[model samples]
Target: TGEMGILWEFDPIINKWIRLSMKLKVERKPFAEGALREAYHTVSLGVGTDENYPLGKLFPPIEMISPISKNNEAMTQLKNGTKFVLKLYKKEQQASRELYFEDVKMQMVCRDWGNKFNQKKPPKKIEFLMSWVVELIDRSPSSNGQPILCSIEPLLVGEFKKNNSNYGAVLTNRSTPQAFSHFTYELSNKQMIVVDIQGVDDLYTDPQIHTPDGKGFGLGNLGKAGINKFITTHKCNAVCALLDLDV
Candidate 1:
């Protein structure tokens, strides 16, 4: 279930759940496929709404927020206070998806990382260069109703600039581009979270650090040396300096 209780897609094949509305898709995959579904089916229904559902035995009931009204309100609240814009891709104005954000500057660094390295073309057609921001939400039996790593702000690092000026100015879309940024959730013996800031692989970079699948549980994927190498190799400090600190 995503923010405001949106249910995108649930596939029994992989025991995976995802939000279809998002450009940057957020997904949740079961640790052991079918374990969650099996638990729901086999568990006996007791009395009352809470007791009658499948939860706490081996898996928890899916987290879903319902009724579009609450979602609309939350969306409004977030967008109102800041320069941030929240783009919702809903069928028939119906919003359903997990919510998350990333630093806009970080996204640009990723883009520059791709351009400098001459990596493979970005898989997705839609460049994060647009104003649409996406987030990954996770609902585990471990946490009650609240999700983890709840919000992020990824500014649209628009089109590549000719003179390296204008942070928001976007370049025309080429037939192909290099990275696809999104979030993936993996369930194993231990809960795992994967967030993609830079997106997939680059031929010139280390495969362990430059994951095409965007796998790995955050910073662990890149150790201190890897992080230092990445920043220096990509000249991230220079890019960060280009953007005003207020943003």
Candidate 2:
């Protein structure tokens, strides 16, 4: 008697949609709660193995490639990691598809820039999150019979540091995150800024994006005002100077 849930994965390489299956052990009570969202511990088991790929009952199982790999080998690796978090809105009903969709997009953007900066190696290498959004379909007897939408991402394996705020760039003395934030601003050509940087060291999650007008990226986008907040507060370190970040 497995509980049914819809899993969504956003493939960045080919930019495809893959709905795979997974076993979610969503805790009854939330393990953590922020101002707007409650975090619940979810233990998910991969529905697709090498054998289960074609035979999975629901949607097809897709394996992700290793991009170009560590030892300079190109291999297709199946990501079946344990311990993912289930993030639901405070009211659960307040969940919007756009909320996490925009989040995923911005995070991927940060990831891309970080990679681009690192390929050439800035003295301080930065790390951003690589994640996909998946929906949990809680179909138990106590369910509302509606698809309970949530974001399934890897649980922050760190103590979860909130280095900077969304509305301000008052950051700690951390080098990589600070430099990376500055990098986002420059590489994007002032079109956008990613603040609200925090999470285990270099890996960040639930980042807030500020567009020129702060119009898009859901509720968290403070727009131009937010970008300016960072501009005034951030003091570039050696990394920024080395990268030639003027602002």
Candidate 3:
């Protein structure tokens, strides 16, 4: 009937009109420990808990990771098992250039943050970080094409708070008793790796991602038609985050 929108589909079993994307079997994959210090992150948007998942239904395939050890000690660890963060992509979204737009938004967010810190006295062009993505061996139908994955790099070792007296960075976590503890304090000496060059942060709203200026990645840039056109010309997709000292 015309009453039902063209995008709607009826499911006999569920006895409800489902959206086109909802007809497929859905699953929420939890992330390995330490990617974002959370086991499961909310992937879907809007007012419901259903969107929580490390890897969503439309995500691109992630490559299988098998670490090999050259030496006996390293081999022993391999035999037991190893933990690695996996970043997945959406094949259909990427091919049509939707992912590219999402990526540009992310880049703008990072650039905005960097610019904020070095506004008056800018240093080196803020080097935004990202990880390499590879195709998955076993492709999933939901992906609509071969999906890709990447290992999360340990860049920011741990979060910390600023000392009231000295204003120095103090290491902190979810359990830290002090209510004033902050994430501004990052490990200065650790090796860095940049992730999510495309700005997936916009897809989900985790409280930890709040900007110092108390504003979200201002969405004004995404509205410009020129920015959209520019991104479509240079399609890009990739995704990263923190250190593994505790893990």
By lDDT, who's the top model here? 2
Mind giving the per-residue lDDT tens digits that candidate 3 earns over 131-167? Answer: 1122222335345443332222112223322211111
Provide TM-scores for the models. 0.21, 0.78, 0.25
Error of 2 at 126 (Å): 2.5
Evaluate all candidate structures by whole-model CA lDDT and list the values in order: 0.24, 0.64, 0.24
lDDT of 1 by residue, 165-190 (tens): 01111122221221121111111111
Candidate ranking under lDDT, highest first, comes to 2, 1, 3
* lDDT of each residue in 1-247, candidate 2, tens digit only: 3344545455566554454555567788898877677888876554432223332222222243322222210011223446667777786454456566555656676676667878757875666655555555455423445445666667777688888887774657877677777888888898987777777877777777788887767678888888888888889888888888885
Predicted structure with the largest TM-score when compared to the true one: 2
Candidate 3 regions exceeding 4 Å error are: 1-29, 32-84, 89-105, 108-119, 122-128, 137-142, 146-155, 160-247
**Residue ranges of candidate 1 with Cα displaced over 4 Å:** 1-53, 56-220, 236-239, 244-247
For candidate 2, report its TM-score: 0.78
